[PDB]
């Protein structure tokens, strides 16, 4: 299995001010490598495209959004003096020739520009177990998993049973909501589903667990509140079968 | 010239099995390429067509897309649509030496549920945690499910599992709030809901 486009880091929390620098490598073969923004007031905007150590064409953002391309085709782009409104998806592209050949994405840096990293916090996870009235009456089983209180949106959910991740039976919001929608600094939710059989839920060897992992603050951020620093990390629950 | 790509619908929802058509249009005729893309939640964008300025369509499986590029347009024909085919749908044109994306069709292709069940569950309390949970699951995907009157109850929309190995798919919306005047029977009184729903005892 090749590489598909990779980029680095996958998630950043900065405060105003700051400044980062984002990495692309393309697919092997791919020479043209392009950059845009996707936030979700403007959709995506095409920042610039490098091709052969050179910016062959360029949006319309100011110059403290940058770039440069290394001679093995790897692309980075910088952004200086950083601002709430930079919190965006900033997603690479490859391709072979951007003229008539399709353009393959990679997955992008998460970047999210706060205020004060007081304002971060990791979620808390927690798993309720089936109703037994679903159970008779459908013989089947749904768990719910909760992730909530976290900001920024830089979770991953997902379910194991008997340490194999699942997929069948799994439904996980596509978006979390904000438990205060007016905020900007509004701390988020989101929920998640499996279903089992009535059967495989009745088997106290069964285990059961929502992991959730959270990007958070790096070793070099300050911290100085009360609280545990908010660093990244997995926030899990669990709950084993049961026969009755 | 400016260049401006627009798309319609801006999001649209239709029961598996029907055909969809998506439409773009761009104000600048002098493009290389128009090309398509679908982008899931939390994910990049896959390429679907790449329709050059020369062509006049492109298909790849159940995706056909036309190009008329003195009119401006391009339009996605997806067939007998599936789940799977739930996304955001982007339209992009290859200007001389831009690069510009619509806004994008946010589709949902809902199953059909074979066998409606409708019920409000109430899930087991956790020890670790202090919120009560309501399970809204099991009712047909005409079903729409609405946000709480109360801003400390939170509700999500209906989500869509798949069992595959008993051939089931079912939606559920859960509700949730950490007050003590706070209950499932009450938890989805801002919905319609079908009046055969199942509200078991406690």
């Known amino acids: 299995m090749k590489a598909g486009v990779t980029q680095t880091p996958r998630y950043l929390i900065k405060t105003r001010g700051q400044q980062v620098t984002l990495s692309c490598s393309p697919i092997?073969?791919?020479?043209?490598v392009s950059w845009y923004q996707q936030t979700p007031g403007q959709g995506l905007q095409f920042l610039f495209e490098y091709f052969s150590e050179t910016q062959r064409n360029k949006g319309n953002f100011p110059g403290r959004f940058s770039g440069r391309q290394f001679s093995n085709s790897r692309s980075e782009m910088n952004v200086s003096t950083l601002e709430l409104g930079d919190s965006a998806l900033y997603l690479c592209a490859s391709s072979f020739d951007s003229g008539n050949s399709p353009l393959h994405f990679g997955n992008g840096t998460r970047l999210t520009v706060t205020e004060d990293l007081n304002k971060v916090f990791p979620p808390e996870v927690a798993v309720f177990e089936p109703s037994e009235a679903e159970i008779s009456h459908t013989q089947k089983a749904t768990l719910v998993c909760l992730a909530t209180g976290f900001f920024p949106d830089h979770v991953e959910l997902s379910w194991w049973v008997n340490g194999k991740e699942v997929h069948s039976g799994v439904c996980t919001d596509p978006q979390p909501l904000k438990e205060q929608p007016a905020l900007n600094d509004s701390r988020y939710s989101l929920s998640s589903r499996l279903r089992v059989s009535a059967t495989f839920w009745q088997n106290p060897r069964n285990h059961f667990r929502c992991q959730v992992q959270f990007y958070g603050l790096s070793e070099n951020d300050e911290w100085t509140q009360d609280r545990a620093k908010p660093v990244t990390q997995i926030v899990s629950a669990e709950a084993w079968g049961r026969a009755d | 010239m400016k260049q401006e790509v627009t798309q319609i619908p801006a999001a649209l929802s239709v029961p598996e099995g029907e055909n969809l058509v998506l439409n773009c249009s761009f104000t600048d005729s002098a493009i290389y390429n128009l090309q398509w893309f679908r982008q899931d939640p939390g994910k990049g964008l896959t390429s679907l067509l790449l329709?050059?300025?020369?062509?006049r369509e492109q298909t790849s499986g159940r995706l056909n897309a036309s190009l008329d590029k003195s009119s401006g347009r391009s339009t996605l024909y997806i067939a007998a649509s599936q789940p799977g085919d739930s996304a955001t749908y982007l339209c992009?044109?290859?200007?001389?030496?831009?690069?510009?994306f619509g806004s994008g069709t946010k589709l949902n292709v809902k199953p059909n549920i074979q066998n409606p069940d409708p019920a409000v569950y109430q899930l087991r309390d956790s020890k670790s945690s202090d919120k009560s949970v309501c399970l809204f699951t099991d009712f047909d995907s005409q079903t729409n499910v609405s946000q709480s009157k109360d801003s400390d109850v939170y509700i999500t929309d209906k989500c869509v599992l798949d069992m595959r190995s008993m051939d089931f798919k079912s939606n559920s919306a859960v509700a949730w709030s950490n007050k003590s005047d706070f209950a499932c029977a009450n938890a989805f009184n801002n919905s319609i809901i079908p009046e055969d729903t199942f509200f078991p005892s406690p």
């Open positions: 329709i050059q300025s020369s062509q």
């Open positions: 092997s073969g791919h020479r043209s």
């Open positions: 992009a044109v290859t200007n001389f030496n831009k690069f510009y």
